[PDB]
Design a protein around this nucleic acid. Structure first.
Ligand SMILES: NC(=[NH2+])NCCC[C@H](N)C(=O)O
Ligand SMILES: [Mg+2]
Ligand SMILES: [Mg+2]
Ligand SMILES: [Mg+2]
Ligand SMILES: [Mg+2]
Ligand SMILES: [Mg+2]
Ligand SMILES: [Mg+2]
Ligand SMILES: [Mg+2]
Ligand SMILES: [Mg+2]
Ligand SMILES: [Mg+2]
Ligand SMILES: [Mg+2]
Ligand SMILES: [Mg+2]
Ligand SMILES: [Mg+2]
Ligand SMILES: [Mg+2]
Ligand SMILES: [Mg+2]
Ligand SMILES: [Mg+2]
Ligand SMILES: [Mg+2]
Ligand SMILES: [Mg+2]
Ligand SMILES: [Mg+2]
Ligand SMILES: [Mg+2]
Ligand SMILES: [Mg+2]
Ligand SMILES: [Mg+2]
Ligand SMILES: [Mg+2]
Ligand SMILES: [Mg+2]
Ligand SMILES: [Mg+2]
Ligand SMILES: [Mg+2]
Ligand SMILES: [Mg+2]
Ligand SMILES: [Mg+2]
Ligand SMILES: [Mg+2]
Ligand SMILES: [Mg+2]
Ligand SMILES: [Mg+2]
Ligand SMILES: [Mg+2]
Ligand SMILES: [Mg+2]
Ligand SMILES: [Mg+2]
Ligand SMILES: [Mg+2]
Ligand SMILES: [Mg+2]
Ligand SMILES: [Mg+2]
Ligand SMILES: [Mg+2]
Ligand SMILES: [Mg+2]
Ligand SMILES: [Mg+2]
Ligand SMILES: [Mg+2]
Ligand SMILES: [Mg+2]
Ligand SMILES: [Mg+2]
Ligand SMILES: [Mg+2]
Ligand SMILES: [Mg+2]
Ligand SMILES: [Mg+2]
Ligand SMILES: [Mg+2]
Ligand SMILES: [Mg+2]
Ligand SMILES: [Mg+2]
Ligand SMILES: [Mg+2]
Ligand SMILES: [Mg+2]
Ligand SMILES: [Mg+2]
Ligand SMILES: [Mg+2]
Ligand SMILES: [Mg+2]
Ligand SMILES: [Mg+2]
Ligand SMILES: [Mg+2]
Ligand SMILES: [Mg+2]
Ligand SMILES: [Mg+2]
Ligand SMILES: [Mg+2]
Ligand SMILES: [Mg+2]
Ligand SMILES: [Mg+2]
Ligand SMILES: [Mg+2]
Ligand SMILES: [Mg+2]
Ligand SMILES: [Mg+2]
Ligand SMILES: [Mg+2]
Ligand SMILES: [Mg+2]
Ligand SMILES: [Mg+2]
Ligand SMILES: [Mg+2]
Ligand SMILES: [Mg+2]
Ligand SMILES: [Mg+2]
Ligand SMILES: [Mg+2]
Ligand SMILES: [Mg+2]
Ligand SMILES: [Mg+2]
Ligand SMILES: [Mg+2]
Ligand SMILES: [Mg+2]
Ligand SMILES: [Mg+2]
Ligand SMILES: [Mg+2]
Ligand SMILES: [Mg+2]
Ligand SMILES: [Mg+2]
Ligand SMILES: [Mg+2]
Ligand SMILES: [Mg+2]
Ligand SMILES: [Mg+2]
Ligand SMILES: [Mg+2]
Ligand SMILES: [Mg+2]
Ligand SMILES: [Mg+2]
Ligand SMILES: [Mg+2]
Ligand SMILES: [Mg+2]
Ligand SMILES: [Mg+2]
Ligand SMILES: [Mg+2]
Ligand SMILES: [Mg+2]
Ligand SMILES: [Mg+2]
Ligand SMILES: [Mg+2]
Ligand SMILES: [Mg+2]
Ligand SMILES: [Mg+2]
Ligand SMILES: [Mg+2]
Ligand SMILES: [Mg+2]
Ligand SMILES: [Mg+2]
Ligand SMILES: [Mg+2]
Ligand SMILES: [Mg+2]
Ligand SMILES: [Mg+2]
Ligand SMILES: [Mg+2]
Ligand SMILES: [Mg+2]
Ligand SMILES: [Mg+2]
Ligand SMILES: [Mg+2]
Ligand SMILES: [Mg+2]
Ligand SMILES: [Mg+2]
Ligand SMILES: [Mg+2]
Ligand SMILES: [Mg+2]
Ligand SMILES: [Mg+2]
Ligand SMILES: [Mg+2]
Ligand SMILES: [Mg+2]
Ligand SMILES: [Mg+2]
Ligand SMILES: [Mg+2]
Ligand SMILES: [Mg+2]
Ligand SMILES: [Mg+2]
Ligand SMILES: [Mg+2]
Ligand SMILES: [Mg+2]
Ligand SMILES: [Mg+2]
Ligand SMILES: [Mg+2]
Ligand SMILES: [Mg+2]
Ligand SMILES: [Mg+2]
Ligand SMILES: [Mg+2]
Ligand SMILES: [Mg+2]
Ligand SMILES: [Mg+2]
Ligand SMILES: [Mg+2]
Ligand SMILES: [Mg+2]
Ligand SMILES: [Mg+2]
Ligand SMILES: [Mg+2]
Ligand SMILES: [Mg+2]
Ligand SMILES: [Mg+2]
Ligand SMILES: [Mg+2]
Ligand SMILES: [Mg+2]
Ligand SMILES: [Mg+2]
Ligand SMILES: [Mg+2]
Ligand SMILES: [Mg+2]
Ligand SMILES: [Mg+2]
Ligand SMILES: [Mg+2]
Ligand SMILES: [Mg+2]
Ligand SMILES: [Mg+2]
Ligand SMILES: [Mg+2]
Ligand SMILES: [Mg+2]
Ligand SMILES: [Mg+2]
Ligand SMILES: [Mg+2]
Ligand SMILES: [Mg+2]
Ligand SMILES: [Mg+2]
Ligand SMILES: [Mg+2]
Ligand SMILES: [Mg+2]
Ligand SMILES: [Mg+2]
Ligand SMILES: [Mg+2]
Ligand SMILES: [Mg+2]
Ligand SMILES: [Mg+2]
Ligand SMILES: [Mg+2]
Ligand SMILES: [Mg+2]
Ligand SMILES: [Mg+2]
Ligand SMILES: [Mg+2]
Ligand SMILES: [Mg+2]
Ligand SMILES: [Mg+2]
Ligand SMILES: [Mg+2]
Ligand SMILES: [Mg+2]
Ligand SMILES: [Mg+2]
Ligand SMILES: [Mg+2]
Ligand SMILES: [Mg+2]
Ligand SMILES: [Mg+2]
Ligand SMILES: [Mg+2]
Ligand SMILES: [Mg+2]
Ligand SMILES: [Mg+2]
Ligand SMILES: [Mg+2]
Ligand SMILES: [Mg+2]
Ligand SMILES: [Mg+2]
Ligand SMILES: [Mg+2]
Ligand SMILES: [Mg+2]
Ligand SMILES: [Mg+2]
Ligand SMILES: [Mg+2]
Ligand SMILES: [Zn+2]
Lengths: 140, 59, 112, 101, 154, 116
RNA sequence: GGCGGUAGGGGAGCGUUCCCGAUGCCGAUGAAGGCCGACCCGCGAGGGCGGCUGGAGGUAAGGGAAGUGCGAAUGCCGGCA
RNA sequence: GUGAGGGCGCGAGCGAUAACGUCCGCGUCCGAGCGCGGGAACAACCGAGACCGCCAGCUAAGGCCCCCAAGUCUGGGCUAA
RNA sequence: AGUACCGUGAGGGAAAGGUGAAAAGAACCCCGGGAGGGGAGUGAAAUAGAGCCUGAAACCGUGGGCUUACAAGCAGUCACGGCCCCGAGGGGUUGUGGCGUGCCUAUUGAAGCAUGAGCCGGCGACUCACGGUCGUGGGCGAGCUUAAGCCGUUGAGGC
């Protein structure tokens, strides 16, 4: 007998409120949901995770003095092209990218990890446009 | 100059990918409005000697 | 029915004549005729001779209509090489390979 | 109605009328053997602790065979040690006759 | 490499050539050069102990006797150098040709008559050997040949 | 007598080149590159048919864990409950029950909870 | 009960050329060699078998004898990149 | 066959209570285990001596929030860097 | 063939065999300047057509199947899936996931930015004599054995 490999099923849409939650502790759960590791038919070679919509990402919280101390970095390939941006400037300029980076750093590397990251939709503020998909509110 | 030299024999894949732009394009021909023979545009028809609707050259 | 023609030991480089052969494969006989006629290459002459010999084979030997002929197959093979000595500087002797081609053209009838 | 049987050190889920290669068994072909049961499922659910007492699966041995040869080869670099072994795992073919609760 | 018919000149300098170092073209590493440890004329003969040869002769005749394929004759009726006469004599003696026979006698005429048969090996008695005995399926001998065989194995 | 190479070396090279079917470029066309690639492949095959058992077991564990967390407890709690209960149904069939017959797996979860 | 293994010691086999076996046996109803096979035997080196090519040679059991097994020597010769 | 050893631990000498330093002693491991698990990766640190197979089970070091198999496990205290 | 070729010279010193049983070696026609080819024709066979038995490999090409333009690689392997083929099985292909530091040589230690190798095919290295020393299969045994030679054989042994 071989192990059951599922047929390509319909993925479910899920909505999460980020407000007041801890950045990393919510990020790990978002990533697990993207993996499909909450489903008993999970398989590592296919994309079968949920579609995770997130609102109020601009109101994420974080412990300690990480407002002025966490430093995201970008090396543009040129000499001296090392950008250092703090968490405060990030929250005030591209706030959803905070959650985006925190999740992207927790998904596997390779192609499948990239499309899994494409299955996540982060939105600053309380409003999202995926009303057509009718997401399921989750209390994570 | 210290005589640069190929480091490794090029794989058939790589040489043919380099040659991927070597395909000839076929000529550009139109019918001559007298003998209906295929000829390059803006040239005098080499099959009837006509251009712009008159004889110019003995064919 | 098919009708083939081969020009063996054509003194020219295969990689050079294949460039012109690739221009007429799958084309109708008249299309290939004009195409070879106004192709600015050396191998155009030889591909033209082989195509005409094939069409003559078709008509005069295999009961095929001239107005139904097209280039069903067309491939160049490489033949023996004429290795020549080329004197270089400082007394070194190179070997130039003067290559040769086997042109093959196969025609058929385009019914309809 | 299905039964989780344990043979050859491994457990398979069987149903009536199922062909199954298991490890080799000391049994003449065409004869019949009873396989222990660890769990019965389907219309009713009884869980073995570890086996279930009066339950057995009747299966008919269809014959014995050798599997597809595996080339197990070992290579140790810079030491001139190379080994080539062919291995064909002996198996027995069984057909599950009935589930005896 | 010393017997090959080339000279011993160094083909090109030792160093700074770009090629591999070499001596002459008679080196066995070259095509057409000498051959390493090639066979030379040899003598595969050795002196086998005499008693071993004599005991082997005895043992071969003893094997053919214990099998029942041994037969002694006094003379050869009327064979006088013709194969047909020997064919008649052998047909009467019980030799149909389905078993290879080792005829051994001192009469040259019989050996001449019999030597062309594809199933007969002829031998003079002084030339009895264990190979030809084991070679053939039956063994036939003169009484003279038998006596000189008893005198050789004695 | 002189025993030249003759016929053997070609046959051995063809045997090694047949095993090389499908390899990229000269790895299927050159006998030597083929032989090297085949050394690598054979060692890979041995080690990977070793590691496949761990691979599948880890997948089974992930699936059993998802099914168990659907019923309150986690994997470790569940396997402890099974150990104490006396249930010796391995993880392959355990995942097969978790997906194919969820009622039997829920009963197993019940016995595991109660067995502590 | 033992069985990772370099230098190295010992053991057992496979295959190539030649001789005895052989005035025999296989062979135009196809020899040797070549191209395939997901088929069979062998742990393996290998041996079978089947199809295609090939067009005249091949050679058993059991023994014997060696110019007896290549991937490298900036190897040697040739062919083509 | 070897008579080029090397890392680590302990005991010393040489050195500067320097060196992936050097020279001995006891031991170990690599060498030959650049096979396997851990240590991000890594001959010699930790676990452990690989006959072959299995989509079975138990452990070692090490681990159980995500990448990444298993606790966002239980009880007490400290730390704000 | 001591040729061609190299050298002032002494001297060095190659490559290169095969149609078929029989030339029956392809009249004649067709495209072409020719070469070459296509029919006819010969033959048991013409991918035996003279660049000729068998025709391997590298290497160049035509066609068909699977696959490939967001992807990080000693090029494989394990698992699953899709497509194609031959008829609870098997073959071909590779999308995704896991794992993974070419071979040889030399070294304390190499994937190593240490050595060697463009690739294929063929050639290429532990032998022989005599003596010695162990072990082993036999023969004889206080004995064992002959060398050169002589006779016989013409692959016969004996003295
Ligand atoms: N009488 C004899 N010893 N003959 C010995 C063999 C003679 C000859 N060579 C043959 O076989 O015909
Ligand atoms: Mg969750
Ligand atoms: Mg934080
Ligand atoms: Mg923005
Ligand atoms: Mg990973
Ligand atoms: Mg310069
Ligand atoms: Mg320059
Ligand atoms: Mg200059
Ligand atoms: Mg420049
Ligand atoms: Mg230059
Ligand atoms: Mg190339
Ligand atoms: Mg390629
Ligand atoms: Mg390129
Ligand atoms: Mg190509
Ligand atoms: Mg005119
Ligand atoms: Mg043009
Ligand atoms: Mg015409
Ligand atoms: Mg010049
Ligand atoms: Mg010069
Ligand atoms: Mg000059
Ligand atoms: Mg060149
Ligand atoms: Mg050249
Ligand atoms: Mg059992
Ligand atoms: Mg069934
Ligand atoms: Mg099995
Ligand atoms: Mg078995
Ligand atoms: Mg290696
Ligand atoms: Mg090695
Ligand atoms: Mg090796
Ligand atoms: Mg010499
Ligand atoms: Mg000399
Ligand atoms: Mg000489
Ligand atoms: Mg000389
Ligand atoms: Mg000379
Ligand atoms: Mg000299
Ligand atoms: Mg010399
Ligand atoms: Mg000299
Ligand atoms: Mg060289
Ligand atoms: Mg030399
Ligand atoms: Mg010489
Ligand atoms: Mg010679
Ligand atoms: Mg010679
Ligand atoms: Mg030699
Ligand atoms: Mg020598
Ligand atoms: Mg002599
Ligand atoms: Mg002698
Ligand atoms: Mg005779
Ligand atoms: Mg005879
Ligand atoms: Mg005779
Ligand atoms: Mg004779
Ligand atoms: Mg050889
Ligand atoms: Mg060969
Ligand atoms: Mg072979
Ligand atoms: Mg072959
Ligand atoms: Mg492939
Ligand atoms: Mg290829
Ligand atoms: Mg192998
Ligand atoms: Mg492993
Ligand atoms: Mg294994
Ligand atoms: Mg295990
Ligand atoms: Mg829980
Ligand atoms: Mg437990
Ligand atoms: Mg258990
Ligand atoms: Mg062991
Ligand atoms: Mg061993
Ligand atoms: Mg050992
Ligand atoms: Mg042998
Ligand atoms: Mg010979
Ligand atoms: Mg001979
Ligand atoms: Mg004979
Ligand atoms: Mg014969
Ligand atoms: Mg016959
Ligand atoms: Mg015939
Ligand atoms: Mg032969
Ligand atoms: Mg075979
Ligand atoms: Mg044999
Ligand atoms: Mg034939
Ligand atoms: Mg054959
Ligand atoms: Mg003959
Ligand atoms: Mg043979
Ligand atoms: Mg023989
Ligand atoms: Mg034999
Ligand atoms: Mg013999
Ligand atoms: Mg040799
Ligand atoms: Mg080697
Ligand atoms: Mg090798
Ligand atoms: Mg070189
Ligand atoms: Mg060089
Ligand atoms: Mg070179
Ligand atoms: Mg180099
Ligand atoms: Mg070479
Ligand atoms: Mg070589
Ligand atoms: Mg060379
Ligand atoms: Mg060369
Ligand atoms: Mg070139
Ligand atoms: Mg030494
Ligand atoms: Mg010394
Ligand atoms: Mg040293
Ligand atoms: Mg020393
Ligand atoms: Mg020391
Ligand atoms: Mg040191
Ligand atoms: Mg030490
Ligand atoms: Mg300590
Ligand atoms: Mg110390
Ligand atoms: Mg200090
Ligand atoms: Mg120190
Ligand atoms: Mg110190
Ligand atoms: Mg030192
Ligand atoms: Mg020292
Ligand atoms: Mg080593
Ligand atoms: Mg060493
Ligand atoms: Mg050790
Ligand atoms: Mg390695
Ligand atoms: Mg390494
Ligand atoms: Mg390790
Ligand atoms: Mg590690
Ligand atoms: Mg790790
Ligand atoms: Mg290690
Ligand atoms: Mg456990
Ligand atoms: Mg522990
Ligand atoms: Mg960790
Ligand atoms: Mg802990
Ligand atoms: Mg990550
Ligand atoms: Mg997890
Ligand atoms: Mg806690
Ligand atoms: Mg500070
Ligand atoms: Mg001079
Ligand atoms: Mg001259
Ligand atoms: Mg000279
Ligand atoms: Mg020469
Ligand atoms: Mg002939
Ligand atoms: Mg002839
Ligand atoms: Mg004509
Ligand atoms: Mg003409
Ligand atoms: Mg004309
Ligand atoms: Mg002509
Ligand atoms: Mg023509
Ligand atoms: Mg013709
Ligand atoms: Mg005819
Ligand atoms: Mg016939
Ligand atoms: Mg043929
Ligand atoms: Mg032929
Ligand atoms: Mg040729
Ligand atoms: Mg030929
Ligand atoms: Mg012949
Ligand atoms: Mg040819
Ligand atoms: Mg070929
Ligand atoms: Mg293609
Ligand atoms: Mg794409
Ligand atoms: Mg991207
Ligand atoms: Mg990476
Ligand atoms: Mg890699
Ligand atoms: Mg398939
Ligand atoms: Mg996995
Ligand atoms: Mg992969
Ligand atoms: Mg690598
Ligand atoms: Mg060295
Ligand atoms: Mg060194
Ligand atoms: Mg060193
Ligand atoms: Mg290297
Ligand atoms: Mg490199
Ligand atoms: Mg060196
Ligand atoms: Mg080397
Ligand atoms: Mg070179
Ligand atoms: Mg190549
Ligand atoms: Mg070779
Ligand atoms: Mg020796
Ligand atoms: Mg010798
Ligand atoms: Mg000797
Ligand atoms: Mg000795
Ligand atoms: Mg004696
Ligand atoms: Mg005795
Ligand atoms: Mg004596
Ligand atoms: Zn005109």
């Amino acid at each position: 007998m071989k192990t059951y490999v599922p047929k390509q099923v319909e993925p479910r849409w899920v909505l999460i409120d980020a407000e007041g939650k801890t950045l990393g502790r919510l990020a790990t759960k978002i990533a697990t949901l993207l993996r499909g590791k909450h489903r008993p038919d999970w398989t590592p070679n296919v994309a079968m995770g949920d579609f995770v919509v997130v609102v109020n990402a601009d109101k994420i919280r974080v412990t300690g003095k990480k407002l002025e101390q966490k430093i995201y970095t970008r090396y543009s390939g040129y000499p001296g092209g090392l950008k250092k941006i703090p968490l405060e400037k990030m929250l005030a300029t591209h706030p959803e990218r905070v959650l985006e980076h925190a999740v992207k750093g927790m998904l596997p590397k390779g192609p499948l990890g990239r499309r899994l990251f494409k299955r996540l939709k982060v939105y600053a503020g309380p409003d999202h446009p995926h009303q057509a998909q009718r997401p399921e509110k989750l209390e994570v | 100059a210290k005589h640069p030299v190929p480091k490794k024999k090029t794989s058939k894949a790589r040489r043919d990918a380099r040659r991927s732009h070597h395909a000839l394009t076929p000529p550009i021909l139109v019918p001559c409005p007298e003998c209906k023979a295929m000829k390059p545009p803006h040239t005098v028809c080499p099959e009837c000697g006509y251009y712009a609707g008159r004889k110019v050259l003995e064919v | 029915m098919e009708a083939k023609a081969i020009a063996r030991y054509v003194r020219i480089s295969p990689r050079k004549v294949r460039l012109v052969v690739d221009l007429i494969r799958g084309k109708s006989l008249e299309e290939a005729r004009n195409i070879l006629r106004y192709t600015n290459k050396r191998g155009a002459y030889f591909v033209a001779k082989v195509l005409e010999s094939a069409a003559a084979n078709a008509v005069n030997n295999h009961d095929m209509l001239e107005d139904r002929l097209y280039v069903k197959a067309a491939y160049v093979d490489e033949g023996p090489a004429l290795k020549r000595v080329l004197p270089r500087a400082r007394g070194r002797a190179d070997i130039i390979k003067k290559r040769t081609s086997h042109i093959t053209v196969i025609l058929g009838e385009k019914h309809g | 109605m299905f039964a989780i049987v344990k043979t050859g050190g491994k457990q398979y889920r069987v149903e009536p009328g199922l062909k199954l290669r298991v490890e080799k068994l000391d049994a003449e072909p065409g004869a019949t053997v009873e396989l222990p049961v660890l769990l019965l499922g389907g219309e009713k659910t009884v869980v073995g602790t570890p086996v279930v007492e009066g339950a057995s699966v009747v299966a008919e041995v269809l014959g014995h065979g050798r599997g597809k040869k595996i080339l197990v080869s070992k290579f140790k670099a810079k030491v001139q040690y190379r080994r080539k072994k062919g291995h064909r795992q002996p198996y027995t073919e069984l057909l599950i006759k009935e589930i005896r609760g | 490499r010393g017997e090959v018919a080339y000279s011993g000149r160094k083909i090109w300098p030792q160093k700074h050539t770009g090629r591999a170092r070499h001596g002459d073209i008679g080196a066995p590493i070259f095509v057409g050069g000498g051959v390493v440890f090639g066979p030379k004329p040899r003598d595969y003969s050795y002196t086998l102990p005499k008693k071993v040869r004599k005991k082997g002769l005895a043992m071969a005749v003893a094997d053919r006797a214990r099998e029942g394929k041994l037969l002694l004759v006094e003379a050869f009726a009327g064979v006088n150098g013709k194969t047909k006469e020997f064919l008649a004599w052998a047909k009467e003696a019980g030799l149909d040709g389905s078993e290879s026979v080792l005829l051994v006698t001192g009469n040259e005429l019989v050996r001449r008559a019999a030597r062309n048969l594809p199933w007969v090996v002829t031998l003079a008695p002084e030339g009895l050997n264990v190979y030809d005995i084991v070679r053939t399926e039956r063994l036939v001998m003169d009484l003279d040949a038998w006596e000189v065989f008893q005198n050789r194995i004695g | 007598p002189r025993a030249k190479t003759g016929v053997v070396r070609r046959r051995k090279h063809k045997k090694i080149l047949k095993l090389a079917k499908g390899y990229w470029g000269l790895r299927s066309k050159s006998f030597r590159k083929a032989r090297e690639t085949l050394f690598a492949a054979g060692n890979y095959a041995y080690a990977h048919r070793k590691r496949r058992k761990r691979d599948f077991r880890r997948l089974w564990i992930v699936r059993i864990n998802a099914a168990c967390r659907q019923h309150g407890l986690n994997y470790s709690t569940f396997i402890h409950g099974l150990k104490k209960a006396g249930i010796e149904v391995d993880r392959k069939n355990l995942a097969d029950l978790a997906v194919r017959e969820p009622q039997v797996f829920a009963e197993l979860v019940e016995r595991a909870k109660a067995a502590q």
